[PDB]
Design a protein around this nucleic acid. Structure first.
Ligand code: NVP
Lengths: 543, 410
DNA sequence: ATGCCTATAGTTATTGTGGCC
RNA sequence: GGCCACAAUAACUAUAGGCAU
């Protein structure tokens, strides 16, 4: 009888009721100003006077933090933030700011009694005048959910009448963009203003309209291009511990537009856990990539909008160890959006495999923003691509990819032989270590008769088996046959280790490139095989 | 109508929506608009917190885009309604037949309306390009496709219409599962097509509207050991390691005599002749591999587990087991030679092959172990997906020991 | 059997950037 | 302080192998 646009029924959680917190102590200096605000909202039709029938109370700051916990769960307003690179290019863009947004869209009668608040008393603890929200209150969890759903119903017939125009809604602000001329675009907004005025929404006039440069989510928007806001960093001394991580976050936000962003060496300093004020000093390797990052930030660059007619092209580059950077572009030189793949969990991930993992990150991101799979350009050869995945256990598929050579080329180091080498010396690999005091031995027994036994300090069982392979390839010719008993050592040689970990393996990898043919075989441990038992007795002699 | 109640304590499903391609998004709107006008789905506000994942699949017979809704989260909570309250009887003489014909009966569920209180739980959100639209919401007014509670309510009507069909053919055993109909016939292949046509004509009389499988050809193929005239040290070392891993599966195989052949350090090039004890043991091990192992039994209380392994050069093998290292059903699919094959397509067709076999023999969806990433699988599985039933799958490591053992299977 | 190591999958807690109440 | 989107870093569970008791 008073509220338009048909109210949507909202109910509380069956577990607990609304707020029951008492009123805050009096201020007197702030109460007098609040009297004029409550009287103005009462005349318009936002709040109404109620008696002592309402038991619920809300403190005036007005805080709705206690109410939100009692209110039922609502579906999320936005599913992923829109990126300026995936947007369509428009000739004229005009924004509309909604005046009295939550004041127009009302609340259901059943929920109106739960949003009742009490104004602090004047003197002698008086009851005062009670008020309850009839419309959507400021600071409620369900406020942005209902308002967005109501606006969709308003602009439902408007989109069908004009399919050529694209309208977007964001909380209170509405963005209108079209490929039409400046004269025709101005008429469409005037018709859009009259459509919103019917329900009761205030829109600014032609003189109060905002200029083509817009500021949204920290991005500077233009009708033809888009650019990020310039980030200013202090250039004197490296301060505290958390500010080092802040520089990584600034580079993280710069990774979406700047292709040359390195963060690997900066994250190495953040290895120290449990610290309030640590103050990390600068090193040679960490500041080396920090110097080149500042040079790219000096020159201003702009991104390009998405075009449906042209296909998306992506290319993979290598800038460091275990770090990949990619750029998506439709036209040469003009980039749309750049990305990165820098996370390393600890163990080896393989350069060929991590490259495919980087592609999958682009593919999934392209579905959300662009909506279609882009054409990839890999720095790996077609011959190397087919050899790796056929022998590997994990299966992956790339639909469309082209071979394009890049300055930082990635090549395979070594490949294990399938058939045993004839006339070559046979090496048996077996090692054992103790948990107490941390001591282990490594040795190898050959068919000729030569053998070497060494002792190691501060080592695990996984490292002692790894050390025995290194010594077997050290005192050998060109063609080496390696027989190992451990399953752990078998998996490392088959794969290609390239990370911060596996420093001991890097000595073996360098030797494997020098050798022409290397054979590897696996045998069961502790059974009674000739050649394996002889090595086992030597390592477990003192252990 | 019948009221549907959820399991006490557990709340409704809340799963995040997976993004879809631009071609699939516009395809979903076309179906949703047609269903809204007929009276199948209705729009709801933002007050609904429950979300259901939705995907788009292509059809072969109708060559059109079909709407697929995943109810795997809801099925775990609504298991009391479809088993305890209204259970589906499963015959033992369904796995033993000559020819099984698969027919889609999912279109018949759009007639029976859903409960008013349960309508809010079947709400789903449609993904959009760059999140331009907030998201168009729809709730199911009738029985949805892919839900296990739909056949339970329809069971009272399904038994009545199949009553004259069962009376005419007592020897032919019929079974209903989810949205697919499975009919097993013991007649000839020329007479099998006539029997299905008569059953399909009965459906048109009621109101609502070559693919064949061989259940007799699912014989367990024995794993055979490679035959060699001259055995070398390298050949023995690989043979001992593979059979030692299978010692926990098969207790009959012993590697005691094989290890005694090698004495001291020797080169792989050297040829070692087998003794009388070595030849007797190796030949005996082949007999244990051919004969089915004792201790294989089906238990409905325990969940079924399936593991698929990649071999290479267009070769795939799978093992169906309830308990670790205790196989129940073994089989392998090589390559679908004819048009186009890839790493995803060969795996997608493999899962659908096991799922169809699981219904006829047992009647439960197994846990699929896939040698693929979660981000890779959840993007390209919809491209080659045809079946309306979606099984539960997990992603784990594939050992090198299990790969080198099942490659010798004929 | 449990505690202690490595690798393959996944999950969470923490911080940061951009916003909001 | 909580909520939303995206990233970097530390911990915890299934599988496979290993060591110690
Ligand atoms: C903030 C925002 C939100 C949603 N879309 C857009 C934008 N705004 C852009 O500024 C914008 C600028 C130029 C062209 N299209 C744009 N766009 C499709 C309508 C442009």
């Amino acid at each position: 009888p008073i509220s338009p646009i048909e109210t949507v029924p909202v109910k509380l959680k069956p577990g607990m009721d609304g707020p029951k917190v008492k009123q805050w102590p009096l201020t007197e200096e702030k109460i007098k100003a609040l009297v004029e605000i409550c009287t103005e909202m009462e005349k318009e039709g936002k709040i109404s006077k109620i008696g002592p029938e309402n038991p619920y109370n809300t403190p005036v700051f007005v805080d709705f933090r206690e109410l939100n916990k009692k209110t039922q769960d609502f579906w999320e307003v936005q599913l992923g933030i829109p990126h300026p690179a995936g947007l369509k290019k428009k000739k004229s863009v005009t924004v509309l700011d909604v005046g009295d947004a939550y004041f127009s869209v009302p609340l259901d009668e059943d929920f109106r009694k739960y949003t009742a608040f009490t104004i602090p008393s004047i003197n002698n603890e008086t009851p005062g005048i009670r008020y309850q929200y009839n419309v959507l209150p400021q600071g409620w969890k369900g406020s942005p959910a209902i308002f967005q759903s109501s606006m969709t119903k308003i602009l439902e017939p408007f989109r069908k009448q004009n399919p050529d125009i694209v309208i977007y809604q964001y909380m209170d602000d509405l963005y209108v963009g079209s490929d039409l001329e400046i004269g025709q675009h101005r008429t469409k907004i005037e018709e859009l203003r009259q459509h919103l005025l019917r329900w009761g929404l205030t829109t600014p006039d032609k003189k109060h309209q905002k200029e083509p440069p817009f500021l949204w989510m920290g991005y500077e928007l233009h009708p033809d291009k888009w650019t990020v806001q310039p980030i200013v960093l202090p250039e004197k001394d490296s301060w505290t511990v958390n500010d080092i991580q802040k520089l990584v976050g600034k580079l993280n936000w710069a990774s979406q537009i700047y292709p040359g962003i390195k963060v690997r060496q900066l994250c190495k300093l953040l290895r120290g856990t449990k610290a309030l004020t640590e103050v990390i000093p600068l090193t040679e390797e960490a500041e080396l990539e920090l110097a080149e990052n500042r040079e790219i930030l000096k020159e201003p660059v702009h991104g390009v909008y998405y075009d449906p007619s042209k296909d998306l092209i992506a290319e993979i580059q290598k800038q460091g160890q275990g770090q990949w950077t990619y750029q998506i572009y439709q036209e040469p030189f003009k980039n749309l959006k750049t990305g990165k793949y820098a996370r390393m969990r600890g163990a080896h991930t393989n350069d060929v495999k991590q490259l495919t993992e980087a592609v999958q990150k682009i593919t999934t991101e392209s579905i959300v923003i662009w909506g279609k799979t882009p054409k990839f350009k890999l720095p790996i050869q077609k011959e190397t691509w087919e050899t790796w995945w056929t022998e590997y256990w994990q299966a992956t598929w790339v639909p469309e990819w082209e071979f394009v050579n890049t300055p930082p080329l990635v090549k395979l180091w070594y490949q294990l032989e399938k058939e045993p080498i004839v006339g070559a010396e046979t090496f048996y690999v077996d090692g054992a270590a103790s948990r107490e005091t941390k001591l282990g031995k490594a040795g190898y027994v050959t068919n000729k008769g030569r053998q070497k036994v060494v002792t190691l300090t501060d080592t695990t069982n996984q490292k002692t088996e790894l050390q025995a392979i290194h010594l077997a390839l050290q005192d050998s010719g060109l063609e080496v046959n390696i027989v190992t008993n451990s399953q752990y050592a078998l998996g490392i040689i088959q794969a290609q280790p390239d990370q911060s970990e596996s420093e001991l393996v890097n000595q073996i990898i360098e030797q494997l490139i020098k050798k022409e043919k290397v054979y590897l075989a696996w045998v069961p441990a502790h059974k009674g095989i000739g050649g394996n038992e002889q090595v086992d007795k030597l390592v477990s002699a003192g252990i | 109508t019948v009221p549907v109640k959820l399991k006490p304590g557990m709340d409704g499903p809340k799963v995040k929506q997976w993004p879809l391609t631009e071609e699939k998004i516009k395809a979903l709107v076309e179906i949703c608009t047609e269903m809204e006008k007929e009276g199948k789905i209705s729009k709801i506000g933002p007050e609904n917190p429950y979300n259901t994942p939705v995907f788009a699949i292509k059809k072969k017979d109708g060559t059109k885009w079909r709407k697929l809704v995943d109810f795997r989260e809801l099925n775990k909570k609504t298991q009391d309604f479809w088993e305890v309250q209204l259970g589906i009887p499963h015959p033992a003489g369904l796995k033993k037949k000559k020819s099984v014909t698969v027919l889609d009966v999912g279109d018949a569920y759009f007639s029976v309306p859903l409960d008013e209180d349960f309508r809010k739980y079947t709400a789903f959100t449609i993904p959009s390009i760059n999140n331009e639209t907030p998201g168009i919401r729809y709730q199911y007014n009738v029985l949805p496709q892919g839900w296990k509670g739909s056949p339970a309510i329809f069971q009272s009507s399904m038994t009545k219409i199949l009553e004259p069909f069962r009376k005419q053919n007592p020897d032919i055993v019929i079974y209903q599962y989810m949205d697919d109909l499975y009919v097993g016939s013991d007649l000839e292949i020329g007479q099998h097509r006539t029997k299905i046509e008569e059953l399909r004509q009965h459906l048109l009389r009621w109101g609502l509207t070559g693919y064949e499988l061989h259940p007799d050809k699912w014989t367990v193929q024995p794993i055979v050991l490679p035959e060699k005239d001259s055995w070398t040290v390298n050949d023995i070392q690989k043979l001992v390691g593979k059979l030692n891993w299978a010692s926990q599966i098969y207790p009959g195989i012993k590697v005691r005599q094989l290890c005694k052949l090698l004495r001291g350090t020797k080169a792989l090039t050297e040829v070692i002749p087998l003794t009388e004890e070595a030849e007797l043991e190796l030949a005996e091990n082949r007999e244990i591999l051919k004969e089915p192992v004792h201790g294989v039994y089906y238990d409905p209380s325990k969940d079924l587990i399936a593991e698929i392994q990649k071999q290479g050069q267009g070769q795939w093998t799978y093992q169906i087991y309830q308990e670790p290292f205790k196989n129940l059903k073994t089989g392998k699919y090589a390559r679908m030679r004819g048009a186009h094959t890839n790493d995803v397509k060969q795996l997608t067709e493999a899962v659908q092959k096991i799922t169809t076999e699981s219904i006829v023999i047992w009647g439960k969806t197994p846990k699929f172990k896939l040698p693929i990433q979660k981000e890779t699988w959840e993007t390209w599985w919809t491209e080659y997906w045809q079946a309306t039933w979606v099984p539960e799958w997990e992603f784990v490591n594939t050992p090198p020991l299990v790969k080198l053992w099942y490659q010798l299977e004929k």
